[PDB]
Design a protein around this ligand. Structure first.
Ligand SMILES: Nc1ncnc2c1ncn2[C@@H]1O[C@H](COP(=O)(O)OP(=O)(O)OP(=O)(O)O)[C@@H](O)[C@H]1O
Ligand SMILES: [K+]
Ligand SMILES: [Mg+2]
Ligand SMILES: [Mg+2]
Ligand SMILES: [Mg+2]
Ligand SMILES: [Mg+2]
Ligand SMILES: [Mg+2]
Ligand SMILES: [Mg+2]
Ligand SMILES: [Mg+2]
Ligand SMILES: [Mg+2]
Ligand SMILES: [Mg+2]
Ligand SMILES: [Mg+2]
Ligand SMILES: [Mg+2]
Ligand SMILES: [Mg+2]
Ligand SMILES: [Mg+2]
Ligand SMILES: [Mg+2]
Ligand SMILES: [Mg+2]
Ligand SMILES: [Mg+2]
Ligand SMILES: [Mg+2]
Lengths: 380, 131, 113, 119, 157, 78, 50, 47, 109
RNA sequence: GCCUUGUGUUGCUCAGACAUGCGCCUAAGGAGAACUCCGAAACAAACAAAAAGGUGCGUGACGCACUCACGAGGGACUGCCAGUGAUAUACUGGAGGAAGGUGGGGAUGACGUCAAGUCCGCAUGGCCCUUAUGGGCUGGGCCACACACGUGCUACAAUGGCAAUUACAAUGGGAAGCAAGGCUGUAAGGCGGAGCGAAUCCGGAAAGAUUGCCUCAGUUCGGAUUGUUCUCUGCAACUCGGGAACAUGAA
């Protein structure tokens, strides 16, 4: 495995001299180091934002997206492309957050588009920008996990289905980052939490409702939901309820693989002694708490075509009709910038690069990011 | 050019098989089709909806074509008469929707008027005067 | 024009084993002409009256169809039908399709509007 | 664990481990796990509440040594009534109309009975 | 041209390299199913394609290292079987080398039970260094050729 | 309806009009179902050559008459 | 397993239907239940599937 | 609302009227019926 | 039509219609041979056959349309052979045989 | 297999245009200052059409450019060039072309040989039977089972098995029939019938691709054998039919 030694050696030698950081038409390839994500400009379109890997994991501790990890393992550098599509979305949500002193911004945005265009990376960069603004950001990088795996028990009052393992993992990924703000905030409803069936341990004997203390914080509520496996589902529902009444800081709910909540789940219910019936995703309690876009809060839902969800309606239920947006593929200048970036990262040889070569690869892959990335070492 | 007189216009289709050999009966002999335009009848919207529900797939929306086909009788003129009787029965049943519309509109209006403190005192005074 | 004849008309469908174009003189006069796909039916028979399984002969039966359009107004349909009843087409069977329009009487149903 | 009348292996997943019970196959195992509300888990990770639920759920189907005894008893009663099927069962011949000229080797045995000593 | 349409569109290859790619894809295809073996071959090429080098020139060198120049044939003279040597032509050298490469890769697949791309790249990389099972097959064939060199002039072709 | 099979069992016509008293005679009707009113009776069932004597018991109810009269002889090879 | 009559391949080889294969009605019912529709909706669907 | 009630009550009663107009046979409970075997031709003569 | 790079197969995107990279490579080969990539807007309607048959039909159609647009690229396309219609089709099954050429197993003794 | 020419409905209708029907999701009240207003209402309605915006499925008018269907033809002949050769017949290369040397495939099968096969398809010379070797019905057998051989199907698996999603055909068949949608049953089935004697109406192609599970096991490989519960055809499924459900799980 001494193959990669030469590439790593030449890459470590290439950082000693800064005259190689030139892109298309000789423009400097990367952003100036003094620029953060909140201050990105029009003039930064077509450049590459450098990151730190440990700092990126600190800002996003719920888990890096598969597209980001796939780009990182092949580019060997924590950098991401800055595009116009992310800037306009950021301007949309900044206008929604605080109006300045004909384009109506939209609160709830669904990101649809061609497969492998970068919806996960755009949503992750938006979540990074919002957490740099210090908002209350609930990030779900894998919406498939909410419907797949674990136990399922029917609620004896509502008729919906309870999933305690996912209900506690949601809270763990929330409080892994949002602990110091949830220490500050306070709850606005003090009704008792009605207990439910535990993950394989059944119904708690003696305890029917957990009473809420007068001085309880959102952190106290979520820690109760984590510590008790008979309360996780109702704590998730309650947490969704208090996420809409907070007035101190802006609150954003970002979901990846949002299309998985509109189809069947893994679980099945016996409806006949010789038959079984599949369960829709809408019948889950934690999905039912979060799926509807008929509210006043800032929601982003990014579809995924890599997961085999299939065909859905153009008029989806419980969402506004105009909520869908198209996330376009690469254009010519974006392809030129990413080709020169891969030239800089030495994914291709210096003696075979040409305008015609990268134009051929771009025209074959039709602007697909993963297909372009997998094709460019075969450039001759 | 269309027919004489005035009224809605029908369109007929009929088949005659000229088989050789002195045996004349062919199964394609007895099928008759008739086509009509729904909007020429001038029915109301609720009457048209009841017609569409009563019809199913004999109605074609791109052409507004109601087409009735009869093969259930042994002779061509019998199937033609059956087609016309069916058309008249369809129009007669489709016209009934106005009465049901009026009845449930009056039911909704009277449900609205029962829950009103202003109208109930006047109604009770008028029924108290005549007892 | 070359658009489709829609209205009062006659359509003749002629089915045959041979091509009707071989004897074109027996066809009725017409405004339009068209042809349908040919249809074949395959038979595979043993050659021998006893065990010669791998020796087969293959025959077929082929059907041919032609479509004729005649424009005719309302008065002369009963005149044309008398002659169309008595034609002699060579090795064929023909199909008389009639397109005509009448009007609707509204009087016994107008009470229901 | 001892469910029904057979051993369920602790290291195996439950959906394939539950098929060890006589009378439980590929589809009844799926029905039983969907009744318990469990997708799939190892048999050593089962809680005692799920164990008594699994025992009461499996007890809703005929299974185990009583099913074996029932099958043996009805095969015996066919022999005792001595119909054609009982005669075939006693002679060890196929009883569902299959040919016996060449291909009845599962009911009869290996071709170790060989030659036949003449043409 | 039907094989490796991607490597034909991203052109700049000669007939010998096109023949090499077509052979390496089609030799192990069974029942007319090309997609799985073409994906395996593409990812085996891609394993050092992301680390500079010219992988097709590496394949040319690797095949040239296992091309055998002489082979044997069984010839019957007066009832006894002799083992007559003979010269191998330019197509048959290529086909024998690629067949030995794929045979050794699949036997390594059965032995270690790992990914087939890993096995194919392992055998090609080791054949680049003048060792391995395919090179030992070449030297064994040359041993059988050079043991029976006295029995040439029994050649009929 | 509590019927598990929608169709009546088959019994031949010369049984349908005499019932039990046509049940102490030779029969040729191998395709007739053995009815629960036929118990405790002796019949002679045709097997192609002879008449097998069979006494109807509880164990034969629901089967056919011909299930108990074998047609082919069990063979013992040389 | 084209000879296993309990599997989809075996049912297709036998030319029949069952729990394993299922007719067109099963696909229609499943696609009606997937997109959140009443079961009396006429086939084909009067929507745009994207 | 009024719109759904007016759009839904006008299409009722059609089930028996359609069968009366078109001569259909109505079997609401799905029992086995001889209609399916009496609706076919009598191929005796042909034979 | 002279354009910017759009390519539609039966009202769908060709990345959607041919998700394999090799079908798209075979479709873009005639453009890359005559060096006119990034100059065209192509709309095609395809039918019948399988997948490689459809790809070959679309490729031959593109080559013929390019020659109709400007006849001086015939010498470019003829060397790669993009103007030769492939005449090879499915051969019929012969009686007394299992397939077109495969016969039944022969018994000699 | 390629190209002309003529005909264009049940077939095609691409781009660029004109007009239209039906179903949805919203919120919407008549009159004199640029129909606006300042006029009427108590309560939400959108009603006889008209009156807004997002849309989904289509149709007509113009055509028949294009695909396709059909009728008639063209084109490929060593025709042309160079060489080898015996200036012949040919052989080896090239140009042009959709196709190059027999373009692919089918049909077509000499004199006679095997006293080849068929008297149980049929017709026939000779012999033979005639209360029977002739004619009818019921029931059985041609499906037996120490064994041997031939032709096939399914497999012994990871280039794979299974589930979910998603693509792409051709030949044919349909009145003793094919049967869309819908209801009912775990399922085979059951009820009912939009259209169609059919370029018009009627039946999810599979391998393939995407995601996930399985991880070398006699297995989530392979489905023989067997039990119970049913179903279809039929006067009738015991010997002796097809199919379903659950279980059993050989080699
Ligand atoms: N701004 C960007 N910077 C770097 N890489 C990008 C960018 N946008 C897209 N890509 C490339 O595209 C690939 C796929 O991105 P991503 O996973 O976001 O697809 P997607 O749009 O989320 O669609 P799906 O979720 O259906 O795969 C990544 O591997 C990445 O390399
Ligand atoms: K048998
Ligand atoms: Mg994603
Ligand atoms: Mg299996
Ligand atoms: Mg159903
Ligand atoms: Mg149906
Ligand atoms: Mg063919
Ligand atoms: Mg033309
Ligand atoms: Mg040539
Ligand atoms: Mg000849
Ligand atoms: Mg002889
Ligand atoms: Mg004889
Ligand atoms: Mg044979
Ligand atoms: Mg009908
Ligand atoms: Mg037909
Ligand atoms: Mg597959
Ligand atoms: Mg896979
Ligand atoms: Mg097994
Ligand atoms: Mg049966």
């Amino acid at each position: 495995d001494d193959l990669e030694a030469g590439r790593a050696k030449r890459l470590a030698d290439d950082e000693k001299t800064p005259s190689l950081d030139v892109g298309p038409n000789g423009r400097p390839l990367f952003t100036p180091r003094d620029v953060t994500l909140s201050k990105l400009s029009q003039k930064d379109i077509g450049s590459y934002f450098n990151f730190d890997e440990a700092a990126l994991k600190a800002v996003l501790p719920e888990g890096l997206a598969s597209g980001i990890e796939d780009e990182f393992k092949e580019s060997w550098r924590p950098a991401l492309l800055v595009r116009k599509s992310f800037l306009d979305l950021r301007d949309n949500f900044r206008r929604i957050a605080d109006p300045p002193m004909g384009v109506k911004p939209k609160k709830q945005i669904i990101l649809d588009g061609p497969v492998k265009s970068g919806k996960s990376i755009a949503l992750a960069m938006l979540v990074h920008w919002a957490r740099d603004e210090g908002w209350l950001v609930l990030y779900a990088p894998k919406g498939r996990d909410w419907t797949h795996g674990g136990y399922f028990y029917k609620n004896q009052h509502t008729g919906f289905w309870d999933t305690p393992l996912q209900a506690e993992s949601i809270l763990k990924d929330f409080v892994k980052f949002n602990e110091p703000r949830l220490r500050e905030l306070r709850c606005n409803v003090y009704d008792p939490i009605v207990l439910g069936e535990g993950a394989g341990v059944g119904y708690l004997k003696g305890q029917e409702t957990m009473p809420i203390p007068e001085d309880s914080t959102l952190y106290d509520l979520v820690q109760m939901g984590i510590n008790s496996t008979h309360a996780a589902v109702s704590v998730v529902v309650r947490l969704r309820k208090e996420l809409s009444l907070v007035k101190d800081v802006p609150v954003l709910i970002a979901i990846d693989q949002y299309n998985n909540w509109f189809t069947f789940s893994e679980f099945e219910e016996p409806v006949t002694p010789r038959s079984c019936r599949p369960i829709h995703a809408r019948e889950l309690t934690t999905v039912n708490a979060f799926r509807s876009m008929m509210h006043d809060d800032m929601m982003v839902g990014a579809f995924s075509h890599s997961t085999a969800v299939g065909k859905l309606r153009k008029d989806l239920p419980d969402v506004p009709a105009d909520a869908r947006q198209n996330f376009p593929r690469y254009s010519l200048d974006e392809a030129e910038a990413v080709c020169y970036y891969y030239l800089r990262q030495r994914l291709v040889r210096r003696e075979v690069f040409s305008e015609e070569n990268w134009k051929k690869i771009y025209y074959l892959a039709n602007g697909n990011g993963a297909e372009m990335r997998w094709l460019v070492p075969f450039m001759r | 050019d269309d027919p004489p007189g005035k009224g809605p216009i029908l369109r007929w289709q009929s088949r005659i098989v000229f088989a050789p050999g002195g045996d004349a009966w062919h199964p394609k002999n007895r099928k008759v089709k008739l086509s009509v335009t729904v909007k020429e009848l001038g029915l109301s919207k609720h009457q048209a909806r009841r017609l569409r529900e009563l019809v199913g797939k004999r109605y074609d929306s791109g052409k507004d074509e109601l087409t009735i086909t009869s093969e259930r009788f042994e002779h061509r003129e019998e199937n033609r008469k059956d087609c016309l009787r069916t058309l008249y029965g369809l129009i007669e049943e489709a016209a009934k929707a106005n009465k049901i519309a009026e009845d449930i509109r009056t039911a909704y209006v009277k449900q609205r008027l029962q829950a009103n403190p202003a109208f109930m005192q006047k109604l009770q005074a008028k029924i108290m005067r005549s007892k | 024009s070359t658009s489709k004849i829609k209205g009062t008309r006659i359509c003749i469908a002629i089915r045959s084993f041979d091509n009707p174009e071989k004897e074109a003189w027996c066809l009725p006069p017409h405004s339009r002409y068209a042809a349908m796909p040919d249809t074949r039916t395959l038979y595979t028979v043993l050659r021998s009256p006893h065990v010669d399984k791998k020796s087969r002969e293959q025959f077929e039966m082929r059907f041919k169809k032609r479509f004729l359009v005649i424009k005719a107004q309302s008065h002369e349909l009963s005149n044309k039908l008398f002659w169309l009843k008595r034609y002699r087409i060579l090795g064929a069977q023909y199909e008389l399709q009639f397109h005509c329009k009448t009007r609707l009487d509204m009087s016994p149903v107008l009470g229901s509007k | 664990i001892r469910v029904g009348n057979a051993e369920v292996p602790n290291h195996k997943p439950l959906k394939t481990g539950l098929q060890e019970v006589y009378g439980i196959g590929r589809r009844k195992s799926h029905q039983v796990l969907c009744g318990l509300g469990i997708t799939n888990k190892l048999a050593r990770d089962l809680t005692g509440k799920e164990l008594i639920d699994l025992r009461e759920e499996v007890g809703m189907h005929q299974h185990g040594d009583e099913l074996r005894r029932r099958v043996g008893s009805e095969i015996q009663r066919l022999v005792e009534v001595d119909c054609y099927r009982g005669s075939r069962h006693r002679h060890g011949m196929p009883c569902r109309g299959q040919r016996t000229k060449t291909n009845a080797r599962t009911k009869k045995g290996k071709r170790v009975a060989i030659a036949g000593k003449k043409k | 041209x039907x094989x490796x349409x991607x490597x034909x569109x991203x052109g700049g290859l000669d007939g010998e390299q096109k023949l090499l790619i077509k052979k390496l894809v089609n030799f192990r295809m069974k029942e007319g199913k090309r997609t799985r073996v073409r994906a395996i071959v593409y990812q085996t090429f891609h394993r050092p394609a992301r680390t500079e080098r010219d992988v097709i020139k590496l394949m040319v060198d690797a095949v040239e290292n296992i091309k055998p120049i002489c082979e044997v044939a069984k010839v019957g003279v007066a009832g006894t079987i002799y083992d007559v040597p003979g010269i191998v032509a330019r197509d048959r050298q290529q086909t024998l080398a690629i067949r030995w490469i794929l045979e050794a890769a699949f036997k390594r697949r059965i032995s270690y039970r790992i990914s087939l791309e890993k096995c194919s790249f392992a055998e090609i990389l080791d054949a680049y260094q003048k060792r391995g099972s395919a090179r030992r097959k070449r030297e064994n064939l040359h041993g059988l050729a050079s043991t029976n060199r006295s029995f040439a002039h029994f050649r009929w072709w | 309806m509590s019927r598990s099979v929608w169709k009546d069992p088959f019994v031949d016509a010369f049984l349908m009009k005499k019932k039990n008293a046509a049940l102490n005679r030779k029969i040729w009707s191998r395709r007739s179902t053995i009815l629960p009113e036929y118990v405790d009776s002796a019949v002679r069932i045709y097997n192609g050559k002879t008449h097998v004597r069979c006494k109807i018991t509880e164990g034969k109810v629901g089967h056919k008459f011909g299930e108990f009269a074998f047609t082919r002889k069990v063979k013992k090879h040389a | 397993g084209r000879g296993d009559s309990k599997t989809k391949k075996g049912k297709r080889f036998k030319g029949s239907y069952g729990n394993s294969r299922g007719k067109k009605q099963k696909m229609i019912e499943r696609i009606k239940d997937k997109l959140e529709l009443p079961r009396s909706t006429p086939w084909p669907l009067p929507f745009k599937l994207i | 609302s009024l719109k759904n009630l007016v759009t839904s009550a006008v299409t009722v009663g059609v089930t028996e009227a359609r069968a009366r107009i078109f001569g259909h046979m109505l079997n609401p409970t799905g029992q086995r019926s001889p209609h399916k075997i009496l609706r076919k031709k009598l191929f005796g003569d042909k034979v | 039509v002279p354009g910017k790079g759009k390519f539609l197969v039966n009202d769908k995107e060709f990345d959607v219609y041919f998700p394999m990279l090799d079908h798209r490579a075979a479709l873009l080969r005639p453009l890359a041979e005559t060096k006119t990539l990034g100059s065209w807007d192509i709309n095609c309607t395809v039918t019948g056959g399988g997948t490689t048959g459809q790809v070959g039909a679309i490729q031959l159609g593109i080559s013929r349309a390019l020659q109709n647009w400007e006849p001086d690229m015939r010498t470019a396309l003829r060397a790669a052979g993009f103007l030769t219609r492939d005449s090879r089709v499915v051969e019929r099954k012969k009686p007394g045989k299992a397939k077109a050429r495969k016969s039944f197993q022969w018994v000699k003794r």
